[PDB]
Scaffold this active site. Structure first.
Site, short mmCIF file in Angstrom:
data_model
loop_
_atom_site.label_atom_id
_atom_site.label_comp_id
_atom_site.label_asym_id
_atom_site.label_seq_id
_atom_site.Cartn_x
_atom_site.Cartn_y
_atom_site.Cartn_z
N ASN A 128 -65.02 -0.18 -69.17
CA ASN A 128 -66.72 1.16 -68.73
C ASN A 128 -67.69 0.40 -69.19
OD1 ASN A 128 -66.43 1.87 -71.71
ND2 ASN A 128 -65.28 3.56 -70.78
N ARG A 176 -73.66 6.95 -80.45
CA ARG A 176 -73.16 7.45 -82.01
C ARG A 176 -73.24 8.61 -82.23
NH1 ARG A 176 -68.30 7.59 -84.85
NH2 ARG A 176 -66.08 7.89 -82.92
N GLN A 199 -68.86 16.58 -82.72
CA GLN A 199 -68.46 16.57 -81.10
C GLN A 199 -67.21 17.05 -80.96
OE1 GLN A 199 -70.73 12.70 -79.03
NE2 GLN A 199 -68.65 12.31 -78.73
N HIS A 214 -69.95 14.47 -73.80
CA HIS A 214 -70.03 12.56 -73.73
C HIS A 214 -68.59 12.13 -72.66
CE1 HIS A 214 -67.50 9.50 -76.28
NE2 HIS A 214 -68.43 9.20 -76.21
#
EC number: 1.17.1.9
Lengths: 374, 367
Positions: A146, A284, A313, A332
């Site tokens: 990805n 991040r 997260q 995300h």
């Protein structure tokens, strides 16, 4: 063998019966020559939702027809989770970076059958590599699956921030017009200075995609690129991040992180950015101090901030980055489009096929093999 | 001389005192070699809001210090508007395509002093060219001033549609997470087939920007591009629009755009399931309800643009709330960057006109 697979939740209205399109565009190899995943067969149709609990990465028929069990769950946190309960006899562990099941040293100690830790996607920061080495656990991921997806997400977020796309669209949706309200924060991207902190698969795909916009491209990295490539895309090298920030209108932070120092962008370092700079952060969440960014956007030192990584997260419902001025945040999700899912679901089976059949796993897939790095 | 300049309203909160940045990136020429506007001076700072009534294109001091009159207004519609009342003695008429003062034949007949019709931007569709030709009225525009701006808007809107950016951002804004709700309508753009209806300044800038994304590029037009340029971007030629639709995952309509409801219920049957349309050319190029129906049935996976019919769009225009839309108001060519260019170009044209020097050839539509 028992395969334990952690995936994220199904959509609100349920698992989809129909999709927007019938197939995915044909792609044969990644930039650089690495071929796409090569399983011997798949039991899903490219384009289906595979990363959710009902999608199961298209694995159940393959594993159950070969005598294996597959336990799929979204419950991954804490000692009382389904994951930690099923982990004691699990031979293989599969999870995505977008909904990761952490293999802490404590948890690996509890996993008395563990032999394979598979990342359906990119990144293995959720797996304690030392404990895997000490236990001869193979750690693999579907490399490059990805990277292009993330790069597309970044360029889109750069354009949206600079051109004030998201407030402009809201004017349309709420029934207004307000041209001047749209454009008093809207610029062209052309001829701006854009820099990236890393020139990896993501960073270099971003650089190539920004080039025809006639921007001035900068980058820092651990290690320089060949001057073949620096020439082709007319790049400016910086030995340090701090040398690059002040000349840049737009800064994008992606992986690989050379020095993962938490809070390396904070109130002090943001004094090195031009007034009205833009930051796009897919690396991040904790790379940027949450309140330093919010302060910067509320004061006008930053003209925009976008990204898909947060701290913590998943982000709590009142996380300031959700509503601060001139943000372009998403959850995300950047590397789990339906297209990327087809690739790391195919790669997951290719790895499982190699593992169960005793064949070598792809060299570029391996992080830890037979008691050492790979 | 009396200059009548129509501009859009100031922001709701009032004219801005400070801006997000201090200057604009330096650009010297457009693709092709044409240089940016070259007036003999500008009396504004690049980056200020110039297209609103309080911005005045940075012209008031220039025209008033030379003995001229300047009337700035945003009231442009109907016979009782400030524009139509002030127009009878106006020597010069200035307006932007994003808030256009229409020069109908009736209005041109009423303007006994009119000598120059100036477009602060690109396009003269709001000016009846026959009436301008018959009356020796000069029609000029700041050619190329916002072509790159529009092209950026198109590529930005394409990515947002394919990747489902706007619903995803809405989940974040509302306090949700919902990864599967975001990505169950999200794809990569890589290796898709993208076609454009025109390969002009905009259409060719869009094509050049899509190339590194590894898309397959198609296009139709009145005239083919040089095979030098068709090669650089691996273009596939199509003699007609209809032949191009069925191979395209993404179709973009650009100017210079049968041009009136050329996208309708019959035409949408030629498109692949899950196609995306981005229309910055004209609102009426697409039938309003045929597009919305297509989005409600799943034949289209997304529609975005900044042009509407009617314009400005009424508050219940279906395109505001239809599924998988990426609409904005009509703003793509009026970023602060483009404003700085066509405000400078507007002054360059006015300087040439009043001083009796030739206007740049590429600025002229009617002379």
């Amino acid at each position: 063998a028992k395969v334990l697979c952690v995936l994220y939740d199904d959509p609100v209205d349920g698992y989809p019966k129909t999709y927007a399109r019938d197939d995915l565009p044909k792609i044969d190899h990644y930039p650089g020559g690495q071929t796409l995943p090569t399983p011997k067969a798949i039991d899903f149709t490219p384009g289906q939702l595979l990363g959710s609990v009902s999608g199961e990465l298209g694995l159940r028929k393959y594993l159950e027809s070969n005598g294996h069990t597959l336990v799929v769950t979204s419950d991954k946190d804490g000692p009382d989770s389904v994951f930690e309960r099923e982990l004691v006899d699990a031979d293989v562990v599969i999870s995505q970076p977008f909904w990761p099941a952490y293999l802490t040293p404590e948890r690996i100690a509890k996993a008395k059958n563990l032999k394979l830790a598979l990342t359906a996607g990119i990144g293995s920061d959720h797996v304690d590599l030392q404990s895997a080495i000490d236990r001869n656990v193979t750690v693999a991921e579907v490399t490059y699956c990805n990277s292009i997806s993330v790069a597309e997400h970044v360029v889109m977020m750069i354009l949206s921030l600079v051109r004030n796309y998201l407030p402009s669209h809201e004017w349309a949706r709420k029934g207004g017009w307000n041209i001047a309200d749209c454009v008093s924060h809207a610029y062209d991207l052309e001829a701006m200075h854009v820099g990236t902190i890393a020139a990896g698969r993501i960073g270099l795909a971003v650089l190539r995609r920004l080039a025809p916009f006639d921007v001035h491209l900068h980058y820092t990295d651990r290690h320089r690129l060949p001057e073949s490539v620096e020439k082709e895309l007319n790049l400016t090298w910086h030995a340090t991040r701090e040398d690059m920030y002040p000349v840049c209108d737009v800064v994008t932070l992606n992986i690989p992180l050379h020095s993962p120092t938490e809070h390396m962008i904070n109130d002090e370092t943001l004094k090195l950015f031009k007034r009205g700079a833009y930051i796009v952060n897919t690396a991040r969440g904790k790379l940027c101090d949450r309140d330093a960014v919010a302060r910067a956007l509320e004061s006008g030192r930053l003209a925009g901030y976008a990204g898909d990584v947060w701290f913590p997260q998943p982000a709590p419902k009142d996380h300031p980055w959700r509503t601060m001025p001139y943000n372009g945040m998403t959850p995300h999700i950047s590397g789990t489009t339906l297209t990327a899912q087809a690739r790391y679901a195919a790669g997951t089976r290719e790895i499982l096929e190699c593992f169960f059949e005793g064949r070598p796993i792809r060299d570029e897939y391996l992080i830890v093999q037979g008691g050492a790095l790979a």
